[PDB]
Amino acid sequence: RPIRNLEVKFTKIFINNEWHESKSGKKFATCNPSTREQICEVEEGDKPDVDKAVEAAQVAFQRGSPWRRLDALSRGRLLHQLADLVERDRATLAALETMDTGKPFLHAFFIDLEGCIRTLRYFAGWADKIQGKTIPTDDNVVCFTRHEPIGVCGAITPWNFPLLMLVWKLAPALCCGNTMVLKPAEQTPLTALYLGSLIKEAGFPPGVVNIVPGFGPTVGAAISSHPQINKIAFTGSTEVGKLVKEAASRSNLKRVTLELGGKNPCIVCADADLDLAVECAHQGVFFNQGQCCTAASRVFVEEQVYSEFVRRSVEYAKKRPVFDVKTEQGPQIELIESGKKEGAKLECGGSAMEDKGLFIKPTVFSEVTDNMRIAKEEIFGPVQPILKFKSIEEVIKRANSTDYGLTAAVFTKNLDKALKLASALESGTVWINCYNALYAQAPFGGFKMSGNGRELGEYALAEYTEVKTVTIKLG
Amino acid sequence: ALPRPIRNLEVKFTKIFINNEWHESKSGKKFATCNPSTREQICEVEEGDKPDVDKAVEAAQVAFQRGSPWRRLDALSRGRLLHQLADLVERDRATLAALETMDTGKPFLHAFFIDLEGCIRTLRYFAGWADKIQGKTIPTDDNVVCFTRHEPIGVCGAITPWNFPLLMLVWKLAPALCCGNTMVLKPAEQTPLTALYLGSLIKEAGFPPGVVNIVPGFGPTVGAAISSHPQINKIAFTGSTEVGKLVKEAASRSNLKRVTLELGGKNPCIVCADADLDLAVECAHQGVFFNQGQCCTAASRVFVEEQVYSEFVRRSVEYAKKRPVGDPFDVKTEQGPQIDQKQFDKILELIESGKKEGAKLECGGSAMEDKGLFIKPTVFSEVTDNMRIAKEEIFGPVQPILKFKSIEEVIKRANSTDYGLTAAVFTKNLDKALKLASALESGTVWINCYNALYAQAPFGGFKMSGNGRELGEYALAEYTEVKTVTIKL
Amino acid sequence: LPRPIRNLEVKFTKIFINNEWHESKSGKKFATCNPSTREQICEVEEGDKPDVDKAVEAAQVAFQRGSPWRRLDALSRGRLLHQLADLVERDRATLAALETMDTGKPFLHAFFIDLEGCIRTLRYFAGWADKIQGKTIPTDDNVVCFTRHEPIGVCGAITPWNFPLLMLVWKLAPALCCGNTMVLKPAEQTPLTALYLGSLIKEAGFPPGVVNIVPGFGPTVGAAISSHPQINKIAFTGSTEVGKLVKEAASRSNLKRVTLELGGKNPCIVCADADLDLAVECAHQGVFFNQGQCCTAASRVFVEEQVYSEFVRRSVEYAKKRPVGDPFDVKTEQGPQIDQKQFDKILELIESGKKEGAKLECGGSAMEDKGLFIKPTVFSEVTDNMRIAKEEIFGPVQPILKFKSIEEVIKRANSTDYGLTAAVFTKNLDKALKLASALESGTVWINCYNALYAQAPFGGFKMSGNGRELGEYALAEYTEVKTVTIKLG
Amino acid sequence: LPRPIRNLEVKFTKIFINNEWHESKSGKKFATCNPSTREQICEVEEGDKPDVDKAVEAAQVAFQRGSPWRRLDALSRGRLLHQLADLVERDRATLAALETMDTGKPFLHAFFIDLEGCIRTLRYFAGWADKIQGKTIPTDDNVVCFTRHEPIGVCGAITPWNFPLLMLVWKLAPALCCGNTMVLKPAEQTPLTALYLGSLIKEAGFPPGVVNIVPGFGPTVGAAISSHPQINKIAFTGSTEVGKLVKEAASRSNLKRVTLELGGKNPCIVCADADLDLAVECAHQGVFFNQGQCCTAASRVFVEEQVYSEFVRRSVEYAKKRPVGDPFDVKTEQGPQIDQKQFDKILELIESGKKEGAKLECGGSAMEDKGLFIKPTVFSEVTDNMRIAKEEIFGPVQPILKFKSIEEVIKRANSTDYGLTAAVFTKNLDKALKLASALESGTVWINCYNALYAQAPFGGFKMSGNGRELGEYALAEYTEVKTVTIKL
Ligand SMILES: NC(=O)c1ccc[n+]([C@@H]2O[C@H](COP(=O)([O-])OP(=O)(O)OC[C@H]3O[C@@H](n4cnc5c(N)ncnc54)[C@H](O)[C@@H]3O)[C@@H](O)[C@H]2O)c1
Ligand SMILES: NC(=O)c1ccc[n+]([C@@H]2O[C@H](COP(=O)([O-])OP(=O)(O)OC[C@H]3O[C@@H](n4cnc5c(N)ncnc54)[C@H](O)[C@@H]3O)[C@@H](O)[C@H]2O)c1
Numbered sequence A: 001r002p003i004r005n006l007e008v009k010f011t012k013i014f015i016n017n018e019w020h021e022s023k024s025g026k027k028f029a030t031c032n033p034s035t036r037e038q039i040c041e042v043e044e045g046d047k048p049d050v051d052k053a054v055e056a057a058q059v060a061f062q063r064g065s066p067w068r069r070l071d072a073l074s075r076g077r078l079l080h081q082l083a084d085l086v087e088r089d090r091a092t093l094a095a096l097e098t099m100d101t102g103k104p105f106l107h108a109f110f111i112d113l114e115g116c117i118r119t120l121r122y123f124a125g126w127a128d129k130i131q132g133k134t135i136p137t138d139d140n141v142v143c144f145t146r147h148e149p150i151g152v153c154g155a156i157t158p159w160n161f162p163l164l165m166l167v168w169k170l171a172p173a174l175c176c177g178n179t180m181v182l183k184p185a186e187q188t189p190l191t192a193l194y195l196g197s198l199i200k201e202a203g204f205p206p207g208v209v210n211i212v213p214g215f216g217p218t219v220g221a222a223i224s225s226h227p228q229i230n231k232i233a234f235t236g237s238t239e240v241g242k243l244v245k246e247a248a249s250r251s252n253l254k255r256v257t258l259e260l261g262g263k264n265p266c267i268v269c270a271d272a273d274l275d276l277a278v279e280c281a282h283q284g285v286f287f288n289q290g291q292c293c294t295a296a297s298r299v300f301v302e303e304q305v306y307s308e309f310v311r312r313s314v315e316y317a318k319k320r321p322v323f324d325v326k327t328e329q330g331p332q333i334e335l336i337e338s339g340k341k342e343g344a345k346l347e348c349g350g351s352a353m354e355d356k357g358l359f360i361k362p363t364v365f366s367e368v369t370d371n372m373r374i375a376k377e378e379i380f381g382p383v384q385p386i387l388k389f390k391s392i393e394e395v396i397k398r399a400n401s402t403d404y405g406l407t408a409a410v411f412t413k414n415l416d417k418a419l420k421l422a423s424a425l426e427s428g429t430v431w432i433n434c435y436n437a438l439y440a441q442a443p444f445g446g447f448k449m450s451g452n453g454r455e456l457g458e459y460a461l462a463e464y465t466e467v468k469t470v471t472i473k474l475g
Numbered sequence B: 001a002l003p004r005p006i007r008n009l010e011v012k013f014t015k016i017f018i019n020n021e022w023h024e025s026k027s028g029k030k031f032a033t034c035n036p037s038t039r040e041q042i043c044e045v046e047e048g049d050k051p052d053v054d055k056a057v058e059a060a061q062v063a064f065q066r067g068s069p070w071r072r073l074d075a076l077s078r079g080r081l082l083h084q085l086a087d088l089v090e091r092d093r094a095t096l097a098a099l100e101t102m103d104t105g106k107p108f109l110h111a112f113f114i115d116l117e118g119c120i121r122t123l124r125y126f127a128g129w130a131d132k133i134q135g136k137t138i139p140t141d142d143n144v145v146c147f148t149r150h151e152p153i154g155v156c157g158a159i160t161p162w163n164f165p166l167l168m169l170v171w172k173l174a175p176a177l178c179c180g181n182t183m184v185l186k187p188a189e190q191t192p193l194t195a196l197y198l199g200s201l202i203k204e205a206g207f208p209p210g211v212v213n214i215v216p217g218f219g220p221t222v223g224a225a226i227s228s229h230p231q232i233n234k235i236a237f238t239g240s241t242e243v244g245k246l247v248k249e250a251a252s253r254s255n256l257k258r259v260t261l262e263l264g265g266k267n268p269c270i271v272c273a274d275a276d277l278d279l280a281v282e283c284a285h286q287g288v289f290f291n292q293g294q295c296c297t298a299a300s301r302v303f304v305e306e307q308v309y310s311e312f313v314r315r316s317v318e319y320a321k322k323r324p325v326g327d328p329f330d331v332k333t334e335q336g337p338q339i340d341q342k343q344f345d346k347i348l349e350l351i352e353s354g355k356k357e358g359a360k361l362e363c364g365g366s367a368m369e370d371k372g373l374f375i376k377p378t379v380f381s382e383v384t385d386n387m388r389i390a391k392e393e394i395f396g397p398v399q400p401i402l403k404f405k406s407i408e409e410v411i412k413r414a415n416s417t418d419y420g421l422t423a424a425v426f427t428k429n430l431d432k433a434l435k436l437a438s439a440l441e442s443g444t445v446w447i448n449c450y451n452a453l454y455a456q457a458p459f460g461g462f463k464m465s466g467n468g469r470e471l472g473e474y475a476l477a478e479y480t481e482v483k484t485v486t487i488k489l
Numbered sequence C: 001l002p003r004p005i006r007n008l009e010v011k012f013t014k015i016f017i018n019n020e021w022h023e024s025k026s027g028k029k030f031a032t033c034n035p036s037t038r039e040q041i042c043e044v045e046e047g048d049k050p051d052v053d054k055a056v057e058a059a060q061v062a063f064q065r066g067s068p069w070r071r072l073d074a075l076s077r078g079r080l081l082h083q084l085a086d087l088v089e090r091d092r093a094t095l096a097a098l099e100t101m102d103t104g105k106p107f108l109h110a111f112f113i114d115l116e117g118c119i120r121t122l123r124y125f126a127g128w129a130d131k132i133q134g135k136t137i138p139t140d141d142n143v144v145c146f147t148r149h150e151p152i153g154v155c156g157a158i159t160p161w162n163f164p165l166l167m168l169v170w171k172l173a174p175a176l177c178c179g180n181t182m183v184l185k186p187a188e189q190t191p192l193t194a195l196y197l198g199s200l201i202k203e204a205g206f207p208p209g210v211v212n213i214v215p216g217f218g219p220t221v222g223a224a225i226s227s228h229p230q231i232n233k234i235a236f237t238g239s240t241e242v243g244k245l246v247k248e249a250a251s252r253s254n255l256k257r258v259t260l261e262l263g264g265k266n267p268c269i270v271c272a273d274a275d276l277d278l279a280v281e282c283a284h285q286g287v288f289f290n291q292g293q294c295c296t297a298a299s300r301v302f303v304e305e306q307v308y309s310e311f312v313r314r315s316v317e318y319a320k321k322r323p324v325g326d327p328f329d330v331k332t333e334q335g336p337q338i339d340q341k342q343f344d345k346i347l348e349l350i351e352s353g354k355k356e357g358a359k360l361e362c363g364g365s366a367m368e369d370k371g372l373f374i375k376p377t378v379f380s381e382v383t384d385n386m387r388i389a390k391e392e393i394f395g396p397v398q399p400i401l402k403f404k405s406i407e408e409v410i411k412r413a414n415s416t417d418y419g420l421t422a423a424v425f426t427k428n429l430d431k432a433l434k435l436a437s438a439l440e441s442g443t444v445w446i447n448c449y450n451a452l453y454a455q456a457p458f459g460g461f462k463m464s465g466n467g468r469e470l471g472e473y474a475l476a477e478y479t480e481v482k483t484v485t486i487k488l489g
Numbered sequence D: 001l002p003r004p005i006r007n008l009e010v011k012f013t014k015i016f017i018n019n020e021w022h023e024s025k026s027g028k029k030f031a032t033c034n035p036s037t038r039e040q041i042c043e044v045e046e047g048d049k050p051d052v053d054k055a056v057e058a059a060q061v062a063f064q065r066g067s068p069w070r071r072l073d074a075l076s077r078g079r080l081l082h083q084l085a086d087l088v089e090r091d092r093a094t095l096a097a098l099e100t101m102d103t104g105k106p107f108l109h110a111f112f113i114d115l116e117g118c119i120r121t122l123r124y125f126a127g128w129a130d131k132i133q134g135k136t137i138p139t140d141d142n143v144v145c146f147t148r149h150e151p152i153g154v155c156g157a158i159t160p161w162n163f164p165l166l167m168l169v170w171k172l173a174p175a176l177c178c179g180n181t182m183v184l185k186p187a188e189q190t191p192l193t194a195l196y197l198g199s200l201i202k203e204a205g206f207p208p209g210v211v212n213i214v215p216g217f218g219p220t221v222g223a224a225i226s227s228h229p230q231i232n233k234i235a236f237t238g239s240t241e242v243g244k245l246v247k248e249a250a251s252r253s254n255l256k257r258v259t260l261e262l263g264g265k266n267p268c269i270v271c272a273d274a275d276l277d278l279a280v281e282c283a284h285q286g287v288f289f290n291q292g293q294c295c296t297a298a299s300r301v302f303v304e305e306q307v308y309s310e311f312v313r314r315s316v317e318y319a320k321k322r323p324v325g326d327p328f329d330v331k332t333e334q335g336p337q338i339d340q341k342q343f344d345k346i347l348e349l350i351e352s353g354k355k356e357g358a359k360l361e362c363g364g365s366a367m368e369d370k371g372l373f374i375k376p377t378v379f380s381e382v383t384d385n386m387r388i389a390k391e392e393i394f395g396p397v398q399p400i401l402k403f404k405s406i407e408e409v410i411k412r413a414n415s416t417d418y419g420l421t422a423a424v425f426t427k428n429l430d431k432a433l434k435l436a437s438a439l440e441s442g443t444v445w446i447n448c449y450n451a452l453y454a455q456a457p458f459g460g461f462k463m464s465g466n467g468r469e470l471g472e473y474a475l476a477e478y479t480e481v482k483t484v485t486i487k488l
Helices: A047-061 A072-088 A090-101 A105-122 A162-175 A190-201 A216-224 A238-251 A274-290 A303-319 A335-341 A392-399 A415-424 A459-464 B050-064 B075-091 B093-104 B108-127 B165-178 B193-204 B219-227 B241-254 B277-293 B306-322 B341-356 B407-414 B430-439 B473-477 C049-063 C074-090 C092-103 C107-126 C166-177 C192-203 C218-226 C240-253 C276-292 C305-321 C340-355 C406-414 C429-438 D049-063 D074-090 D092-103 D107-126 D164-177 D192-203 D218-226 D240-253 D276-292 D305-320 D340-355 D406-413 D429-438 D473-477
Strands: A013-015 A018-020 A027-032 A037-043 A133-135 A141-149 A152-156 A179-183 A209-211 A231-235 A255-259 A264-268 A296-302 A345-348 A363-368 A383-389 A407-411 A429-431 A465-473 B016-018 B021-023 B030-034 B041-046 B135-138 B144-152 B155-159 B182-186 B212-214 B234-238 B258-262 B267-271 B299-305 B360-363 B378-381 B398-404 B422-426 B444-447 B480-488 C015-017 C020-022 C029-033 C040-045 C143-151 C154-158 C181-185 C211-213 C233-237 C257-261 C266-270 C298-304 C360-362 C377-379 C397-403 C422-425 C443-446 C479-487 D015-017 D020-022 D029-033 D040-045 D134-137 D143-151 D154-158 D181-185 D211-213 D233-237 D257-261 D266-270 D298-304 D359-362 D377-382 D397-403 D421-425 D443-446 D479-487
Touching (some): A013 A047, A013 A190, A027 A090, A037 A190, A047 A179, A047 A209, A072 A162, A090 A105, A105 D074, A133 C143, A152 A162, A152 A216, A162 A179, A162 A190, A162 A231, A190 A209, A231 A238, A231 A459, A238 A255, A264 A274, A274 A296, A274 A303, A274 A383, A296 A303, A296 A392, A303 A345, A303 A383, A335 A345, A335 A363, A335 A383, A383 A392, A392 A415, A407 A415, A415 C429, A459 A465, B016 B193, B050 B155, B050 B182, B050 B212, B050 B219, B075 B093, B075 B165, B075 B193, B075 C107, B093 B108, B093 B165, B093 B193, B144 D134, B155 B165, B165 B193, B165 B234, B165 B473, B182 B219, B219 B241, B234 B241, B241 B258, B277 B299, B277 B306, B299 B407, B306 B360, B398 B407, B407 B430, B430 B444, B430 D429, C015 C049, C040 C192, C049 C181, C049 C211, C074 C092, C074 C107, C074 C166, C074 C192, C092 C192, C107 C166, C154 C166, C154 C218, C166 C181, C166 C233, C181 C218, C192 C211, C218 C233, C218 C240, C233 C240, C240 C257, C266 C276, C266 C406, C276 C298, C276 C305, C276 C397, C276 C422, C298 C305, C298 C406, C305 C397, C406 C429, C429 C443, D049 D154, D049 D211, D049 D218, D074 D092, D074 D107, D074 D164, D074 D192, D092 D107, D092 D164, D092 D192, D107 D164, D154 D164, D154 D218, D164 D181, D164 D192, D164 D473, D181 D218, D192 D211, D218 D233, D218 D240, D233 D240, D266 D406, D298 D406, D305 D359, D397 D406, D406 D429, D429 D443, D473 D479
Parallel strands (some): A152 A231, A179 A209, A264 A296, A264 A407, A296 A383, A465 B444, B155 B182, B234 B258, B267 B299, B422 B444, C154 C181, C154 C233, C181 C211, C233 C257, C266 C298, C266 C422, C298 C397, C422 C443, C443 D479, C479 D443, D154 D233, D181 D211, D266 D298, D266 D421, D298 D397, D377 D397, D421 D443
Antiparallel strands (some): A013 A209, A027 A037, A133 A141, B016 B021, B016 B212, B030 B041, B135 D134, B360 B378, C360 C377, D015 D020, D029 D040, D134 D143, D143 D479
C-alpha cells in the first residue's frame, strides 16, 4: 500500500482544465513536515491569477454555457464519476496528503479520503432533488420559488484536512450548478491540485473548477475582495474568517459561510459508561495531535467520578504508539506553563518528545478551572484539561461560557440527562455516547463565533443557492 | 366605508421601551420628528445612545435566558401571542395608520390598507409557523440516532428605514418572535412613532417583559451600538446599500453575529408589444410612483419595445398628470410629500440631470408649489442606459422610459447593474414570460403584475441588493440555528 | 372551574345542508339517550341515502370552480378556521355539556380534553392553510416542472361515539384547510355535538355547502357515503370490521380515497430501571381513561420480574381509590360506560380472566346495576394466551403481564396484527431508543401516555389503519398532487 | 447505433426466491410468444399460491429485524441500487431485446426509452436512500417529539404487459431504497425481463429474499399476493377492473396498503394559437407511441375550429408515413399489437367508430393479412358520445374532436371518470396556466407530450388511480410514519 517515493505530477495553476504558470513567474515551495525537506516548487498565484480564474468561472457559469445546459441528473453523474476516480486514485491522494501534512497514510486513506468520497456521492444524489416551492396565495395567481445557483463561489481551506475540507465545499457547490475558484493553504496545495486533474478526467467543462495556490494575503485576499465572486466558504482561523467577511462586505456583499474553531467541551456524568468516556474523550483531545476543529479542549467530569476518570486518562496517554502500518500520530506542521502558574496539576507529559520534530508529549491537567487560559484559549495541541462540576445546571452554564459553539459531547446513561444537555448546550453538534461521528448527510457547523452557515446534509444546499420568487397574475 | 382620518392625533408614546416599561434617555436628550406635510414638528422623542442600547440588550438577553417565561412557552402559545398582537394592531389600526401618515407623508388610506394590512397578515402568517418549525430525523447507521433541532439564535437586532417604518420592523419582528428569540429594535430617526406605539401593544398582548425592546435614536450612534454588540446574535437591516456594508462589516468585526440585509435596487419593468398595454401601463405607473416613489421595489427602468413605445409613453403621461397630489389625510390624494428636505433635493437635482443629459421630458420636472416638499409626477422618454436617471436610485416620483428591440437584448440591459431586488415583465407570451423569469437576476420577478407581495412568499435580493430572505418559510432560516444531535447506542 | 349545565336543552337536531336545517326526506327520526341518567334526551332526524344524495351535491356545488369557497385566498381559508375555533371556545361549556350528556364523559374531561383538543387542532390547521406547498422540480434546461397540492374534493367523515366531536375535528380541520368540502356523519349514539358545530360553521362564515352533516345509522347513511359515486375521499374512525367494509365499498364504487383509524391492542412496557411511581400513574390513566373506551387504551401492560409485584399493588391503590360517579360532579374521574350493551360486553371478558386463571387485585364486578358503572379492575399473572390480553376489551381492565428480557418483550408486543400506540418506561437512554425503534406502533410514548399534539401525527400500523391524522402528514390525505410540466421553445 | 440481437437465447425461466431459481410446485409451465413472429419463445415456470407463500415467506425473513438487509446503512442501500443500475446499463441490449421479443416493442424504442427509464429511475432513488427524513416537531419545553419514516414491510408489485420492466422498476426502485422486501409478479404475457432482472439483483449483491419473482397468472398468483395476510403493501399497475379487485382483497385480508395506477381517457387540447406543427407531432407520438398501448395515450384530441381541418390533414400525413414493421429493423416505429385478444379488441372499436359516423381519414383495418399489425388510423368529426371517444382503445387510433370555447373544452375534458394525464398546446400564458389549473389530471403537459422524469411524480386523479410514483412523493408510499414522543 504505502507509496513512499511518490512523484508529484501537478504543481501548476488549474484554470479552464489547462495547466498554467504564474503571471509573475513566482513559485513557492512545499515541504514534507515529517522530513523537513522540500518536496517541490508549486506555482505562486497572486491577484492577476485570481482574475483569470474568476473570468473562467464566469464564462462557464454564463447562461447558455455547457455546464448550465446540463440537465440535473447529469450534474449528478459527473460527481459520481469524480468520486469513482478519487476512489480509483485513492492511495495516491492518500500518499500525497501524507506527504504535505504528516498525517499517517492509513488515516488519510481511511478518514480524509473516505470522507471525500462519501461526501461526493452524498451530494451527487441532491442534484435532481433541489426543489423550490409552489406557494398558495390568491385565486388569480401562480407564485413559486426557484432555487437558483448563486454563481462564482470561492473556497479557502486550512492545512489540517486540506482535501476533505475542500471537498466539503466543492460537492454541494457543484451539485447546485455553481462554478468555483479554489485556494488550498500554502502549506498543503498538492491533493487539491491533483483533484483538478481528476475534475478534468471526470468530464466537468472548463472553468467550472479552477485552482490557484498561493498565500492568504495575496491569493486569498484577492478572492474575498473580488467584485465578481458571488459567494465564499472559508475554513480556517477565527482571526482570518473575520477578515474574509470584512472583505466581502467592502467589495460586493458576496455571501460568506465560515467554519472556524472552538473550545469544545466533553461532559462526563457520574452515571456515564466511564471507560468509553475516557476512550472517546481521549480520541477527542488528542486525535491528529489536537489539530482538528472538533478537538475536545474542555473535559468536564462529575465529582463522584473525577479522580477515577483522570487516572484512566493518564493511563491512556502514554500507551499508544508513536507511512508505517502502526503509526498513529504524525508531526506538527506556553499554555502548559500558564496552567502551572495558575495552579492546575499535571499528571503526565509537560514537555517535548525527543529531538526529531515538533512533537509534544500527551499532557493531562487536573484541578483545572474556568478562569484558566487552558480552558479559555484554543490550544491547537495535545493538552487535556479536566475540570470538575457538581450540578448538571452548573456544567450547562460553564460549558456555554465561551464565544464558541462548534461541537459538544455528553456521556451518560440517563435518557433525561442526555436530551436535557443536548437541548441546553450551545453547539452546532452534540454527540451523546460518541465523539467525531460525522456524516455526509448530517449538517456540521458552529454557533456563535465558531462560524456562520452549515456544511454537509441538506442544509448545505441553502448556502449554495439563491432563492428567486416568480409571482404571476392571470387575467 | 373608509376609516375616518385622525388629523388631531396626539402622540402618546415617545420614550424608550425596555423591559415592558418606558424610560427616558440615559443622557436625558431628545430629538424631534416633524410632519412632512404640515412642516410642523409633531413631538420630541427620546434620543438614544450606546448606554441605552446596552440597557436594552441585557433585557433581551435576560428574557432569552434558559428558564425564562419566554423560553418555557409552548410553541403554540408563542404563536397565540403573535395572534393576539395582530388583534391589537387591527383594533388600533386607524390610530397606527395615522401615526405612519403623520411621520412619513404617506396617504392615510395607503398606510391603512397597505402598510397595516401587511403588518397584520404577516404577523398572522408567522403566528402560524410557530409550531411548524421542524427539524429533521436523518438516516445514518443502524446503531445511531441522528436528528436536527432548529434552535432560536438568541438576541436579534432590527434597524429599519423611514419609507416603511412599521412594515419593515414587523417583517423582522414576526418571524423573529415566531421562532422564539428576543429583540432590540431601532427605527429610523425620521420615523420613530409607529414603532413606539407598537411598544405599548406588544405589552398589552402579553409578551413577557424583555422579549421586545425599542431604542430609538441615530444611525452612527444606536445603529452602530447594535451592529457592533457582542451579545447580539443576528441582525436584520433594511436600508441604503452603503449602510449595509457598514453594518455587515461591524457584525463581522465584533462577534461574527449574523446578518440579513435588504438594500435598494434598480428595478427593471419590461414591456413587450404582445403585452396587455393597458395593464402594463397601469402597473408600471403604480410601480414607479407608489409611496411617492420612495420604495425599494420601485420601477426605476421601464423598458418598452419600439412597436408599442410611443403609445406607452402617451398612456403613461396621462396617468402621471391625472394622479392626485396633496394632503395625506384627504381621501382622494394618492401622492404626498417627500419625506424631508434632503430627498426633495436629491430627487430635484437628479431631475435636472435627466434634462442636462438630453432626455425628452413628458410631464412635471419641478417641485409643485413652494409650500412644501411636493414633486410633480415626472415622466422621461428617449431614455438610455448611461443617463444618471438610468443608473442611480431616484427614490422619487420619476418614470424613466427606455427602449429595446430584442428580448436577449433587454435581458443584458436589465442585468447590467450591481443590484437585483425586483423585476417585472409584461407579455402575453408563455415562452417569453418564463424565459425572462429564468434570466432576470432579481429575487422577485413579477409577470403581468407589480408590487404583488405575500407574507408567504419570500423577499430579498441578488447580488448587492441584499443577503438573506424575508417573508415566507424561508424567513425562518434567518432566525434559527441548526443543531445536529448524533447518538450512538 | 366552569359550572356544569345539568339540564341543557338541545337546539340543533336536524340535517345540516347548505347552512340550513332540514328534516329527513322519509320523515323518520331516532332518539339519543344519556348513560348517566338513562333518560332519552331528544329525537334527532334520521337520514338515509336521499339525505346523503342531497348533501353530496351541496358539497359538490360548493367545491365547484368559481365558488366563493374556491376563490378564497389561502389566508382567508385559515381565518375561517380561526374564527370557528373562537366560537368553539365561546360555546365551549355548552359543547362540553352536550358531549357529557350524550356519552357519559365526566363533564370536565369533555371540557379540558375533548374540546381543548378540537380547539387546538382547529387552530393548528388554520395555520397550515397558506403553507400547503408543492414543489418546483429540476428536470431539463428547457422545462419548467412543478407540482401543485390540490384539494381532493367532497370528503366524507364517519366517526365513532367515544370521542364524537374530537374525531370529527381531526378530519374537518385539515380537510377545510386544504380547501375541500365535506359531508359529515356522526355515530347514531352521539349525534348532538356535531349538529351543534354546524351552527358554528354557519356563524363563523364558511359558505353554504362547504360542510354538511347528515346524522343517521351506519348501515344506512354511512354505507351511502362509502358507496357514493361523487364522494372523492373518506376518513373513517371506528372498529376494524366496519373499516374493511368501507374500504371494500370504496373500491367497488369510484376508488375514492380512504384513510382509517381502527383499534389496536396497545402495549405498555415497563422496565426495572423505570421511575416506578410515574410508570404506575401512566399505565393507570392509560388503561382507564375515558372508561377504557379509547382507541389509545393500554390493553397489555408488561412489567419486568424484579419490579413486578410492587407495580401491581400501587396500580390497585390507584384503581380502588379513583372516584367513579355522576359526570357533572367536579371530583368524578370516571363516568358511566356508554350504554347498557358496551357495559355488558366487557363483564363477559372479566370472567375470561377468572375462567383461565388470573389473580384479580381490585374490582371485578359491575358496581350497582341501575347505572352503567364497573369498578376499576386490575388483573395480574396475566399471560399471552389469555383472551383478556388479546381481544379488544373496550373498558376499565388492567391486564398485567410478566417478562425478563428486552428481546422477549419486543416480539410479544409486536405479535398482534395491530400497532396504533405503544409506551415505554425506563430511565435508560439506549433501552428507550432501542424499543422506540423496535416497536411497530404509529406512536411510541416514552415515560408518558396519551401525550398527543395537533402537531404530531397519529395513525396505526398494520390492521390498526392506514393514513395519518394530525401533524403535517395529515394534509397529504386531503390533497391530490398534480404535476404541471411545461416545455419552452 | 446499438445492434439488434435477433435470435437471442433466453437463460432465465424459473421462479426467483432467496436468490435461487426454482421450479413450480406443480411443475407446470406456461408459454411465452413473440407478437411479431407468432412463434413461441420459451416456456416459463407457472406459479400459484404455494409458490407465492414460499416467496412471501422469504421476503418476511429478509425484512426480519436483525436481518442483513435491515442492518445495511443508509448509503449502502443506495450503493446496491446504483450497482443494479450499473448492471442494467451493462446488459441494456440483452434486456431491450427481451422486451421487444416479449412485447413487440421496437428494439430502439425499448432501448432508448424503456431501459433508459429503468436506469434513471434506479439511479434517482439510489439517491434518496440516505435522504429519507422524518421531522423533529416542537411541542412543549418538557417534550422531545420526532417522526421516523420506516419501511412498511413486504411489498407486492403487479404490473401490466405494456411496460413490463419499466413499471416493475417504478415500484422496486423506491421500495428498495426505503428498506423494504418485495414479491414481484409480472404479466403472464411478458415475464422475461422481470426474470432477467433477478440475475442482476443477485449479481449486484442484494441479500437473498430481498426481491422475489413469481411469474404466472392474475387470478392465481396476483390473487395470492393481493390477499396475502403477510404482505404489507401492494403496488398495482393495470386495468381499473383488476385494480378494484386488488383493492377489495387488500381490504378483506389484512388491510394492506394499496397504490394503483390505472388507465385514463386522456385529453390533448390544441388551441388555434398553438404551434400547430408542434401540436401535430406531439399529439401524433402521444396516440401512437407503443402501438397505442400506453396509459399516457392521448385518446381524445380536442382541436379548436380554425385550425381543426388543417390539424387533421397533417395528422394523417404523419399517420401514413409512420413505418410499421419488424421491431428489430432500425426504420420501424410501430410494431405488432401485443397479442390476439387486443388485436381483435382494437379492430372492433375501429368498426364502432365507423358504425357511429366518424369520418375515417386513414387505416380502419388490420394490415399484413395475418400478423398482429394494425394500420395507423385517424378518425375525424368525432363527438363525445361515440365509443372511440369513451373507451380506452389501447391501439393506434387517433380520435379527433372539435371545440369552440375554452370552458367547453375544460368541461368535456373533465367529463370522464379518469384523470391520469392531459396536455395543452398554446402560446398564451394565461390560457395555459388556467387550463393547467382546471384540468383534473395527475399530469398536465404544456407544449409537449409524454415528458416524464424520475423526479416528477406520476399518478391518477379520480378512477385513474390513487397515490404516486416517481419523485419524492413515491417515498411516502413505501414508508410508514412513526411518531416518537418523550417526556422528560
Ligand atoms: N440604492 C440603495 O442601496 C439605497 C437604498 C435605500 C436608500 N438609499 C439612499 O439613502 C437615503 C436615505 O437613507 P435610508 O434611511 O433609506 O437608509 P439608511 O441606511 O440611511 O437608514 C436606515 C437605517 O439605518 C440606520 N443607520 C444609519 N447609519 C447607520 C450606521 N452607521 N450603523 C447602523 N445603522 C445606521 C438609520 O438610523 C436607519 O435606522 C436616500 O437618499 C436614498 O437615496 C439608497
Ligand atoms: N383502465 C382500464 O380499464 C384498462 C387498462 C388497460 C387494459 N384494460 C383491459 O385489460 C386487458 C389487458 O390487461 P392489462 O395487463 O393491461 O391489465 P390487467 O388488469 O388485465 O392485469 C395486469 C396485471 O394484473 C394481473 N392480474 C390479473 N388478474 C388479477 C387478479 N385477479 N388478481 C391479482 N392480479 C391480477 C395480471 O396478471 C398482470 O400481472 C385489455 O384487454 C383491456 O381490455 C383495461
